[PDB]
Amino acid sequence: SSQDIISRINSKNINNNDSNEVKRIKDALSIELYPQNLSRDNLKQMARYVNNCVLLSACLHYNIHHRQDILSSKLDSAIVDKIIFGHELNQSYSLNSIDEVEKEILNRYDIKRESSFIISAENYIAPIIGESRHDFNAVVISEYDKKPYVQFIDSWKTSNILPSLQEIKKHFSSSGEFYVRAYD
Ligand code: NA
């Protein structure tokens, strides 16, 4: 798979309107197992390893999928997805709150055991700039004899890379859509 990334990122079959973006990605991206059942501490180490929020979140998603620390950073999510995964990842319908994101993810896990997702928020409050598009990650953690829970992961937000639901909710007002996507 990582060799397919290398082929895509260096290819000449690219619309020149996308050239600078692909170059920014190529410049940032580095290419170098974790257990099948991840722990919260595993996720912390993976989030630290990878660290632009769209690139970071896609890198982390990829690493989680392969259970290995492969991609890191040293942007249109469609272009990023095409490079890292080889296609755009299919999205959910728009969701209206981070609470609803959590519920949808728990439902997907309940039915299909799908456990790792990229979240795209429209009106995330970033420092200084305010409401803005922001990507981050969510993984379902299953600890012994405990109900599965959603761990949000924001590898960009280095002050708190594993926020609680309460903490991440601080970064939203009622303004905003959310979308969930995942590599299959
Ligand atoms: Na926070």
Numbering used by the authors: 8 to 39, 45 to 63, 72 to 94, 103 to 212
Relevant lines from the article:
In this work we have determined the structure of SpvD, a S. typhimurium SPI-2 T3SS effector protein that inhibits the NF-κB signaling pathway. In this work we determined the structure of SpvD and showed that it is a hydrolase with a papain-like fold and a catalytic triad composed of Cys-73, His-162, and Asp-182. Structurally, SpvD can be classified as belonging to the CA clan of cysteine proteases that contains papain and related proteases (MEROPS peptidase database). Although SpvD is highly conserved among different serovars of S. enterica, serovars Typhimurium and Enteritidis differ in containing an arginine or glycine, respectively, at residue 161 near the active site.
After unsuccessful crystallization of wild-type SpvD, we obtained crystals of SpvD in which its predicted surface cysteines were mutated (SpvDC37S/C122S/C160S/C170S, hereafter referred to as SpvD4CS), and these diffracted to 1.5 Å resolution. Subsequent structure determination revealed that SpvD adopts an α+β fold with a total of 7 α-helices, 6 β-strands, and a short stretch of 310 helix. Its central core is composed of a β-sheet formed by four antiparallel β-strands (β3–6) surrounded by five α-helices (α3–7). Additionally, there is a smaller β-sheet (β1–2) surrounded by α-helices 1–5. Close inspection of a shallow groove on the protein surface between helices α4/α5, strand β4, and the β5-α7 loop revealed a potential hydrolase active site including a catalytic triad of cysteine (Cys-73), histidine (His-162), and aspartic acid (Asp-182). The position of the superimposed five C-terminal amino acids of ubiquitin (RLRGG) is unobstructed in the SpvD4CS/G161/C73A variant (right), whereas in SpvD4CS/R161, binding would be impeded by the side chain of Arg-161, which restricts access to the active site (left). Therefore, the Arg-161 side chain could have an inhibitory steric or regulatory role in the activity of SpvD. Despite being less active in the DUB-GloTM assay, SpvDA154/R161 was the most active SpvD variant in the Ub-AML deconjugation assay. The fact that the SpvDR161 variant is present in all Salmonella serovars except Enteritidis, Bovismorbificans, and Abortus-equi is intriguing. It is possible that SpvDR161 has gained a different substrate specificity that is not related to NF-κB signaling.
